[PDB]
Amino acid sequence: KLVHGGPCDKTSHPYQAALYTSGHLLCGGVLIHPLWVLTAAHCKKPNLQVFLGKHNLRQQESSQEQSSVVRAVIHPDYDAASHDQDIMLLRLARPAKLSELIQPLPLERDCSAQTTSCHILGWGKTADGDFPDTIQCAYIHLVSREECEHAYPGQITQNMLCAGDEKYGKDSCQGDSGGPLVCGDHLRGLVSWGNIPCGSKEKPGVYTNVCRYTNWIQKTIQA
């Protein structure tokens, strides 16, 4: 079965970050630069802590190797009621030391990119119990903007995209928000609202349209 696999068989996802506040895992995120993690604006909380290169995490996580966030930059036009422009940059206390276990994910710079086969990542417990949180992965497909707008009338802006699968995710769709939607091995979206983290075709998940933000991200990082 060697290679016969895909992202969801991977034991490690080097670009997946976990965001904690007061000892509890609140959201996922994505390492996009050694000094910055990208997540949803709806994930903003005080004194955020980030864990990189992790596979399994617990509440009051003791396994150190964490990095405190020293600056949080929410998109200035974020609107909580609509979740329009649901994106936020987190500056780490130290640059991440890249390794086999920690690597940034490149951003999709082309809003017209053609790849529609994707996967999402989120932190969750594989099954009812009390085991640690682990990375839940599922395969899904992008849904056309017109189809997206029909499922959520009057609520979809150009800063959002939809994705889902008739199967209702990928028989393993536990997971939180703020984490990545990855298409063609680039960051295409962040889990934002709707039927998440895996939507169906007629009630899809809604994701921040990351390709819209490449200039703002660059301006902020280079500032």
Swiss-Prot record:
GO terms of molecular function: serine-type endopeptidase activity
Disulphide bond pairs: C8-C137, C27-C43, C111-C211, C118-C183, C148-C162, C173-C198
UniProt subcellular location: Secreted; Nucleus, Nucleolus; Cytoplasm; Mitochondrion
Domain Peptidase S1: 2-222
EC number from the UniProt entry: 3.4.21.-
UniProt record, GO biological process: amyloid precursor protein metabolic process; central nervous system development; collagen catabolic process; hormone metabolic process; myelination; positive regulation of G protein-coupled receptor signaling pathway; protein autoprocessing; protein maturation
Keyword flag Iron: no
Annotated glycan sites: Q114
Activity regulation (UniProt): Inhibited by a range of serine protease inhibitors including soybean trypsin inhibitor, benzamidine and serpins. Activated by a range of glycosaminoglycans including chondroitin sulfate, dermatan sulfate, heparan sulfate and heparin.
Annotated catalytic residues: H42 (charge relay system), D86 (charge relay system), S177 (charge relay system)
Enzyme class: hydrolase
Gene Ontology terms: cellular component: cornified envelope; cytoplasm; endoplasmic reticulum; extracellular region; extracellular space; intercellular bridge; mitochondrion; nuclear membrane
Superkingdom of the source species: Eukaryota
TM helices/strands, residue ranges: none
Record keywords: Autocatalytic cleavage, Cleavage on pair of basic residues, Cytoplasm, Disulfide bond, Endoplasmic reticulum, Glycoprotein, Hydrolase, Microsome, Mitochondrion, Nucleus, Protease, Secreted, Serine protease, Signal, Zymogen
CDD domains to which the protein is assigned, alphabetical: Tryp_SPc
InterPro entries reported for this sequence: Peptidase_S1_PA (IPR009003), Peptidase_S1_PA_chymotrypsin (IPR043504), Peptidase_S1A (IPR001314), Trypsin_dom (IPR001254), TRYPSIN_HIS (IPR018114), TRYPSIN_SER (IPR033116)
Cited function: Serine protease which exhibits a preference for Arg over Lys in the substrate P1 position and for Ser or Pro in the P2 position. Shows activity against amyloid precursor protein, myelin basic protein, gelatin, casein and extracellular matrix proteins such as fibronectin, laminin, vitronectin and collagen. Degrades alpha-synuclein and prevents its polymerization, indicating that it may be involved in the pathogenesis of Parkinson disease and other synucleinopathies. May be involved in regulation of axon outgrowth following spinal cord injury.
Protein name (record): Kallikrein-6
